[PDB]
Write a protein that binds this ligand. Sequence first.
Ligand SMILES: O=S(=O)(Cc1ccccc1)Nc1c(F)cc(Oc2ncccc2-c2ccnc(N[C@@H]3CNC[C@@H](F)C3)n2)c(F)c1F
Length: 403
Amino acid sequence: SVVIVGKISFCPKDVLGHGAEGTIVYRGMFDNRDVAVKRILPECFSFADREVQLLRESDEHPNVIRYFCTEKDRQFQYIAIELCAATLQEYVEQKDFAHLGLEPITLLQQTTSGLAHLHSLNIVHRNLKPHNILISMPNAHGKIKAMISDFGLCKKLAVGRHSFSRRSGVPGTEGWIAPEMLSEDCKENPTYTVDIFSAGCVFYYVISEGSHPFGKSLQRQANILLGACSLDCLHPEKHEDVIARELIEKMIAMDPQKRPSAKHVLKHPFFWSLEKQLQFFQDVSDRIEKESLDGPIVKQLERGGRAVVKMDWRENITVPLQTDLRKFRTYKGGSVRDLLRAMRNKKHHYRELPAEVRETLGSLPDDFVCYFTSRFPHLLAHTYRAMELCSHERLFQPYYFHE
Ligand SMILES: O=S(=O)(Cc1ccccc1)Nc1c(F)cc(Oc2ncccc2-c2ccnc(N[C@@H]3CNC[C@@H](F)C3)n2)c(F)c1F
């Protein structure tokens, strides 16, 4: 019943899954650890050593599946990796999100961290999808993490090239392949941003709890060539969906040059805590406090500002807050900058507002910054884009990725 091949033992009755072409995965043991064990044809009929070596160079990162050993003795080779709780697919399909909190977001973050590690090593993955993202068993503190796996299509690029030929292997998995991998008329070679495209689809798949930007399975790939995507799950007037839409629409752009790099994605407010959101608002208002209203920065900030502040943002805050501004008023209700100014001031003087004002805002910082983003769902997304003019400044390094 149990099979043994060196330090690797496994029972063939416990099949965890498949890969393709006689690829099979069993539950097993190596050393004294719980592993999953993928069985692959020998190197004669696999040509998998180059890609196992890439797994070797990458697996140090916590969000790249840890790889333990391979053994060759039999007809086959056996690759032992860390035994995991679920694929991301199973997680999205089988698990009640009501009770999970920010956990799905952090799995997206951890996946992006792992992908940024790969790209930093000049490795492109080329086959990212929920089935390929593993979820760890709980650690001693009951925490879990996502890990990139499945290196069968990974390529290391030479140091002078930032692209590879698209005729250079299987395109990937239907439904998750960047359009430049398949499109007929395409004068530009694929790059790292095929992973960002696939990642963008995974993001929506998670936060939509199982839907896909380009439709149901049978039209996905076709809609990808046509660029007919849809993010229906993202309400256009909820702060969190607004922020998520703004990132995902960039990750899945038809133009690969418009897609954010993984390090940019890691910086996006999609991943910011409330505390970090409020701190961004404060740093912005400090930055522009003595900027000319005619200057580039403020001008950029105010374009389209009326929709963001809802014409008169003073008629869109609770009354106890309205009366606290009038004490020393003079606030323009159409100015984004003056909305941020008010926020900065009430934050800075928070330990002094009247009780009813402190209670209408909520606790500093979590409830406080939600008082505003919930009332002006476009404010942060608007401010993030406008303030890219200062992304090169030491002040704004926590918020943007720059060289
Ligand atoms: O990175 S590789 O491609 C390195 C490589 C590079 C080039 C050529 C070949 C290999 N190897 C590589 C890989 F992708 C995936 C592997 O495993 C799997 N495959 C398919 C489906 C699931 C798993 C798996 C893995 C770990 N835990 C669990 N737990 C279960 C999850 N769901 C419910 C419960 F069943 C518990 N399921 C695997 F074992 C590998 F070795």
